[PDB]
């Protein structure tokens, strides 16, 4: 985006600071080469001579401005998007009820408690549970005051600037690249729901290449479907962006916003409008008041599926401003946010399309990092997406995602305090499809001091999960 105002006011809005990530027995074992983000600017491990909250900032370099011609040809491509999208959706995107906003729905996970609520909540020293009832699905005095605020289209509102405490490669904690959390007050993050909940509950229900979404998938049963449809291509692309949530530009992000949530496909009208106070945004990091033009705030609870859309237009885009007579159909994609697999029995060439990219403000990077740019006949089997590669399981014959060996000791190594036994068997889930001795190997610092599920009890567990014709196909 583009930063056009940077000030200081001396109402501080502090941030954490200090990791809760304490290192595991399995950290002494592996030595990995990750660890607990930078948190502080004071971090012994950071490289001397570097500030933590300048970096940050560093992936705003500009709100990159598109001619009158490349708006046309975008909005044509959201348009085209959008048809698609809602022909397989349907067009019942009426508002949903408070009580469905706060509880969920089919297809639509419930608000969180526990979780920061915003500002100026954090200001107030007021809690997610003092404002909202989550078990009533209720809502307090001046949430509904903002509600009907937003109605009336005039909300006021910052972002509070979190820093993401996780573990990272330890050279994204020594060049202090520490990510961050753009934390919209709860009441934006529920009206949002209001206005488009119940189209993320069909979008989620509904992942698929056809919707060129995984967002709502769950990747040990949906590997086996995504898998056996990019098989089916001459050509697969493994295409990472460089910060892609921070460039998408005004026009782009405007335009998806008018293309897609149209009162024409069931929408109420501040679905665009409450989309649109994304664009030009207020952040509340570091020294408080930071104003941005352009790019999406990192975490709002539509952020993924927003994402995700801008990401299926974009290849539309691009590849129309390259080629003549591209279709919908000329390629087929998958994407979860930023992360994007492309598929096609044409020819195209993702290297000159690099520069159509960067007309949306977007750099386009091939996954390897290495050849020299995008090659041809790469397969489904040679991608990684959602950090998981696609290998085909020997004893049935489908998909499953398998996570790097390396990263999954990452994950084993730090853990917050108390919790290392439900995380055991939370990350046995995902290496069970490492293979058994990959698997023993992984779980072995913990032997005789946390329950270890056996491979065979969560191999099976996995087998009935792709279909339970499979796992009575036995016996
Ligand atoms: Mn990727």
Request: include cysteine; aromatic fraction near 10%; glycine fraction near 8%.
């Amino acid at each position: 985006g583009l930063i056009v105002d940077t000030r200081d006011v001396e109402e501080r809005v502090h941030v954490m600071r200090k990791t809760k990530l304490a290192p595991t027995v399995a950290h002494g074992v592996f030595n990995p080469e990750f660890g607990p983000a930078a948190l502080s600017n004071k971090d012994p491990r950071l490289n001397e001579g570097v500030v933590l909250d300048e970096v940050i900032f560093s992936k705003h370099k500009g709100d990159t401005k598109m001619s009158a011609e490349d708006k046309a040809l975008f909005r044509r491509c959201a348009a085209d998007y959008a048809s698609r999208l809602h022909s397989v959706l349907g067009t019942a995107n009426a508002p949903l009820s408070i009580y469905e906003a706060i509880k969920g729905v089919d297809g639509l996970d419930a608000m969180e408690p526990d979780t920061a609520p915003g500002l100026p909540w954090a200001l107030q020293g007021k809690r997610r549970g003092a404002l909202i009832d989550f078990e009533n699905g209720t809502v307090g005095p001046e949430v509904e005051a903002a509600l009907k605020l937003m109605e009336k289209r005039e909300y006021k509102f910052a972002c509070q600037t979190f820093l993401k405490d996780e573990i990272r490669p330890m050279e994204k904690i020594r060049a202090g690249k520490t990510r961050i959390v753009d934390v919209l007050p709860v009441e934006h993050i529920l009206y949002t729901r209001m206005m488009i909940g119940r189209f993320c509950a069909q979008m989620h229900s509904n992942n698929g290449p056809q919707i060129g979404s995984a967002v709502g998938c769950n990747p040990d049963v949906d590997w086996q479907r995504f898998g056996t449809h990019f098989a089916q291509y001459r050509n697969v692309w493994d295409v990472d962006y460089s910060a892609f949530d921070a460039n998408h530009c005004s026009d782009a992000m405007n335009i998806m916003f008018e293309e897609v949530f149209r009162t024409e496909f069931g929408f109420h009208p501040n679905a665009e409008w409450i989309l649109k106070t994304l664009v030009n945004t207020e952040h509340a990091y570091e020294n408080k008041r930071i104003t941005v033009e352009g790019g999406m705030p990192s975490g709002c609870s539509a952020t993924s599926i927003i994402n995700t859309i801008l990401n299926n237009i974009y290849v539309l885009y691009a590849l129309r401003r390259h080629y003549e007579g591209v279709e919908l159909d000329t390629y087929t994609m998958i994407s979860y946010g930023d992360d994007i697999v492309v598929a096609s029995d044409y020819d195209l060439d993702f290297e000159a399309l690099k520069p159509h990219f960067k007309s949306l403000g977007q750099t386009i990077t091939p996954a390897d990092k290495s050849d020299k740019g995008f090659v041809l006949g790469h397969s489904i089997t040679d991608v990684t997406f959602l950090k998981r590669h696609f290998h085909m399981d020997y004893g049935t014959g489908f998909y499953k995602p398998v996570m790097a060996s390396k990263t999954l000791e990452a994950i084993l190594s730090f853990a917050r305090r108390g919790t290392i036994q439900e995380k055991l068997i939370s990350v046995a889930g995902l290496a069970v499809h490492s293979g058994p001795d990959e698997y023993r190997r992984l779980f072995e610092p913990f032997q005789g001091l946390f329950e270890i599920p056996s491979y065979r009890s969560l191999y099976l567990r996995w087998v009935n999960a792709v279909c339970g014709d499979a796992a009575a196909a036995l016996e």
